[PDB]
Design a protein around this nucleic acid. Sequence first.
DNA 1: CCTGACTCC
DNA 2: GGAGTCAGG
Length: 546
Amino acid sequence: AKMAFTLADRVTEEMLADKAALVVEVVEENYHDAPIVGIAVVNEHGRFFLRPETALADPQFVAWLGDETKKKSMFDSKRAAVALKWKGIELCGVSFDLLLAAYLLDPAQGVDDVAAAAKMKQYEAVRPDEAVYGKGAKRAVPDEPVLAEHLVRKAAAIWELERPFLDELRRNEQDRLLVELEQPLSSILAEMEFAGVKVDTKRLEQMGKELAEQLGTVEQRIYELAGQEFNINSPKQLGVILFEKLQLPVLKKTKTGYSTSADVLEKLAPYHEIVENILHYRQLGKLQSTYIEGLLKVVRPATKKVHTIFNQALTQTGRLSSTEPNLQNIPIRLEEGRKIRQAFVPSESDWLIFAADYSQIELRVLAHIAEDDNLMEAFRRNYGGISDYGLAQNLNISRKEAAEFIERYFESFPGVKRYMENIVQEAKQKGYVTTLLHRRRYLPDITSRNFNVRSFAERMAMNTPIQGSAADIIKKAMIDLNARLKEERLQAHLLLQVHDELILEAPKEEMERLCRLVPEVMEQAVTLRVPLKVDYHYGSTWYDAK
DNA sequence: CCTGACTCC
DNA sequence: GGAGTCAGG
């Protein structure tokens, strides 16, 4: 463990080379408006650590950061890019992201620091972040020399690992997936996250006031029906009320006790009316805790904006996730919760929200992959590896009739049946399944002798190519869309992606254009054997974009 | 801290 | 099938 570097006091010309590994260290998990604690640069000329107060106020270093012809290899470049946006600095020229490279090679490793990526190539001259910063309340930036060494070691690791990772991606036919899709998408997501979405806090607070009143009412009604006060938000206490006091049938247990899941409670409605009230209560309580209170807590008060983080290197299928706040699970199915969307508004006066969604993209993808004539034919003119049991439990119908449904289904769509058979056999033979744009998921459990383990892996084999291909497509569509927006000099920009949906805001005068541009681009992102279809709506709030 | 509840795709 | 957050414990 011997590695020389310069702890620099000022920026020098040799630090500004046209190819470098760059570390812009942000220690907080949520990098919005978070401190940059240190910088490291490794390039042909040497290894350098820079204090951010120095480097970020240096016009030549800022210039270098923003120069796209000066190429940087990084790890989680979006964290750096956004943290620098909050410092009013533009980051360009990112040509390699070790995080996204590691993610494509194997999503299951859950790589989230340089040390874990390095482990994939047996590179061990770098420590884990957790080792250096510590955890929980003990989390702290160490003394400068210890910090400096770590940052330089991380940059040095990125320097040496770039070619080995690129080499393996290319052997996997995933190099273009990294360079032409994930990496450009990363810059787009950074834009969306920094832009944020404006919230109508006056409206959200008034909703919370009315909701608190309504919860109280429902709560007292439940106690009345139960004959006793108890904590409705405790499945344990609730279980005692339902299955001991009221002596309702026990339909399901889990490892900790009686199940009070929504499915179960719905099936108990013919026994006691309290179960319908309880389901209602738990819905309203989630609205209050999460979409009123939890959302207000993360609103930046001066701008009334919320800034999510789209985790690009987390899910096993290639989807994004959204955290702090999650803006990909805002209520829509019940009118009571859907009204939450009235609180999401345009960031400027006389702008509107525009929302466009793919219709049944996973079913069109299945049609394409399976080349099922009947299914493809229908699309030119169901989501349930569900079993007869799950289907019956889902539809609250006869398990015998459920079995007949699934049977009839594969009779009618023999291409889909063939596909399900073939993809499982392929997974067993190769050890992984792949998506349309060459995303991979490894399934080492697929030949387990244990029924449950094997079966879960077989269902992943069936679903991942479908769900992950749909992810591939919308990602490409975002890249295509952004470009067309910039070409036409539109002010419209993306705010959110919700898996098979894109949400934008824009001057009212641009709706007409977007109504043609967004759907076309999204539909023409890839050519399948069936058409892609997109629906679109716009309005004064997200609610009204329906 | 995990579990089980609600939320979305 | 894929996700995140919350209260309770």
